[PDB]
Subunit: 296 residues, 4 copies
């Protein structure tokens, strides 16, 4: 199977006067490339995919593809939907725009059955010839891709190569790699990056790496080399910021931190997302002061 693994970043989407700040978007991706990141994920959850137009989806994916040309860095495009016909369309568009693979979140809100999830992802996988990574985040979608369903999709669909897990469930992480060790388990939960990697996970899709890409990169590559002492040390050091970045729903804290570090020009969200409370604004700033933040 063709795979996309390593240290990866769920890119925030900067706004300027209500529109995508395309120059800032490119600059942020270049900063990720220059700090050891192996792949970037445009228009995922952290990129506020739910409130972007389809034209803005295309714009962000195109900027990512253009910015990564001539480098080893891959573009793993967000391309999921609650509707199978739309997810298929978004997958084909991402492939057409030059993405290296797609990240496809489990359908949110309508709670498909496992049989429905299987048919959903089978249709997506058959629509493109680039790698497809599943994305399980039950706290946001209201459903769970079961271990058996993930494994069947991995075994039955050539291009589906693993899953990004954001489920706080290390038992499931053991279950997955014990019964199908060929899959690429990817951490979607920064605080437990090291435990997932040390059980044989092969990468992360990180929120924290927006702010600290070098530290997440080093953690991941230490772990992939089985230098678990050094990987755990970084995971432990990062725990405080990893947690404070979820004091309100992601991406409210990470966008706040990027603004606080001068990495984006405006603290703009698209409704229903909005600025954090004053108290959390201050708490994020205080945690940030403990970390070494790379510039441009």
């Amino acid at each position: 199977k063709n795979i996309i693994i390593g240290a990866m970043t769920a890119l925030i989407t900067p706004f300027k006067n209500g529109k995508v700040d395309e120059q800032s978007y490119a600059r942020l991706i270049k900063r990720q490339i220059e700090n050891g990141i192996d792949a970037v994920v445009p228009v995922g959850t952290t990129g506020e995919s739910a409130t972007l137009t389809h034209e803005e989806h295309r714009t962000c994916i195109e900027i990512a593809v253009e910015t990564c040309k001539g480098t080893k860095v891959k573009v793993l495009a967000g391309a999921g939907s609650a509707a199978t016909h739309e997810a298929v369309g978004l997958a084909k568009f991402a492939k057409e725009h030059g993405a290296d693979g797609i990240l496809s979140v489990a359908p949110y809100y309508n709670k498909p059955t496992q049989q429905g999830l299987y048919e959903h992802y089978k249709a997506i996988a058959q629509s493109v010839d680039i790698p497809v990574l599943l994305y399980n985040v039950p706290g946001r979608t209201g459903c769970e891709i079961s271990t058996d369903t993930i494994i069947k999709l991995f075994r039955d669909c050539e291009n589906i190569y693993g899953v990004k897990e954001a489920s706080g469930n290390i038992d499931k992480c053991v279950d997955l790699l014990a019964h199908e060790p060929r899959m690429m388990l990817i951490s979607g939960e920064d605080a437990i990056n090291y435990p997932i990697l040390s059980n044989g996970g092969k990468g992360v899709i990180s929120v924290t790496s927006n702010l600290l890409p070098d530290m997440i990169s080093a953690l991941t590559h230490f772990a992939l080399d089985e230098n678990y002492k050094e990987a755990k040390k970084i995971n432990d050091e990062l725990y405080n910021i990893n947690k404070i970045l979820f004091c309100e729903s992601n991406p409210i804290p990470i966008k706040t931190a990027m603004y606080l570090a001068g990495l984006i020009e405006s603290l703009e969200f698209r409704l229903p997302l909005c600025s954090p409370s004053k108290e959390n604004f201050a708490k994020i700033e205080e945690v940030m002061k403990k970390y070494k933040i790379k510039g441009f």
Copy 2:
């Protein structure tokens, strides 16, 4: 406040060869009108709103408005989204097409804060001059509209008149009506229709009423008339079917039941929804036989 209350039906959306069966849709609404229902909800969760196109949303709302014209049955159109700009557009769209009010689900997947939910619904309410009913269903959305946020929205926004609760939380139902008894609490969970109504709830938005509109409307009208003995009698009699209609994610069982009862021509869903398991298909068919199902 202008309100829309009483016995209401979250209409299924029948498909024929992958398209909305417009004649069946009108025929089903006529059947609701003839069995005492007070309002119909096109393109809600039960109507597979997530997989319909915007043109299909318009078609369903237009059929609902036309079929109810001259009958005093109101149209409470589903018009929610994870994106405030889209939810506002859908609200204005529903008003333009003649809806009497809108049902607007809490944003799914992106988990707005309470502050964001307030700004979200404030924007929606300000965009139209028809009643707006909030819809809280945390098991599907991943977020909860708190009692404080619901009450602030009710008091601050002229058009917001209540909430459809699908949360299995009778404590919260007491909390809501004890602190703001002027709001219209609407049951969004059929099995507990009577407990919500007997605490001062003023209506239901029902799944079961697709199949048994006469029984759900009588239950609601018994309760609103303070005949709690007879309202509870129907709620108790309905418990078995009320539960089996969620043995898989709604609307998979109710569409199965409508097909089994001869009320729709084909058991078609849009992916990622699909037919139930063979065992659940059998369980639904067995529970249905204990009830008298009105024809056309």
Copy 3:
């Protein structure tokens, strides 16, 4: 079946210098009798059953029996355990000391299966000839007596006449009385006393009635008389105090309130229970000032 229903109080156990204050206990029970209560529950959860000795269990039950002599007020003795042999012994114990019935909590900590729960309660019921009320509180015990198991026990064992539910699950309350309308469903959660009674529940076992016995007895008796309007009025008025009495684990707040009202001499718990935080102490004091607390 012989039954014990109506307005009932889960009695606090006052301590003086670490010992059960027998004079205060009798005085508090008399205050319940004089304010319309139908039965009292010595040495339940609210009575700190977990930290009392077997001899202190005896003392409290005997005082309850003695104080109720010459009145209609029943003694429904706490007599449950995680060990079946101990629960049997405590049941016979309670009957020997003159109790009118027993309240028997589901085994905590060891998580028996439904078959084990059936055998547990069958053994208890066969050990005495007085009524036995089941008590389901999964947040405390770690297990749930299912509806099916409750109904089988009710139908198979002469003495088992119902269940006290503290489970935040009005759906289950419908389930229970829809399938077995002959049982006595008793509210174990004060905030939802009225919804449980209006669905056909026949009593409450209350924490709040320790402080406000007249209001809880009036609420229950209105509901039993089918004056649902007047019962709901009291339930709504009591919501604030009903909630603040669980701002920390019961009985920490109710003992605090009894101390603040001058009804017990000292704010004494047995470890691991202890005084509330200063912040919660103040919140309890403020909520109390909206209510008329009967003296002796």
Copy 4:
């Protein structure tokens, strides 16, 4: 004072077994109990836990609690194997009494479960464990299992207890919460985190946990011991390989509430004479009995 964290703490770590308690005609089978502990000793186990959850502590009498601790202490004499006695209670006065008892009968330390059923606050848990720790001079391992107790010892409370009390040296976690496991050792790396959930033994050890208190080791003591000692030597390949191989049995041993499956498995393997529980525990369903039997076929089960 608040500065015990780097002062000398006696610890009990390594591969440890939560011993089942065999019954014969309703009584503790004392000969079987001794024989089972011998089998653990001979298969590389570092400590045994008498009368914990797996030992049906809830249904044993105080006298049976006594007898089981005494047999464990006597059987482990003359070996390296430690006795970490179950000694917890929902009542602080009883937990103190059980702690002193375990010390006076020769236990090496105590495992003290968070109070069940009465749901103490964090302040109450702190005072609870401070009282227990001050009553003895032997090591105390906290035990957090919220699915059974209805309460949680928070990370801050565990760390405060470690720093404020001389003899509290760590926590057995059975909480399905690897985030909390990171939280604990990132903020207080000096404590001994012990796995209380067999399926995730390797993830807990690879994050710096220093032992397991195992259900599976009743049946497969050599495998759990090997897993633990590989991990302690930082042979993470070998440790993970065993953890993966054990997943099927690790999960099926909880298809019904522990210890119903493990006693069923011990009976099926001929290691105990009768499948007897004390009510309210009882035999598994016939379907789960068969599932346990089938999962066992994958594994090499040591005899006596």
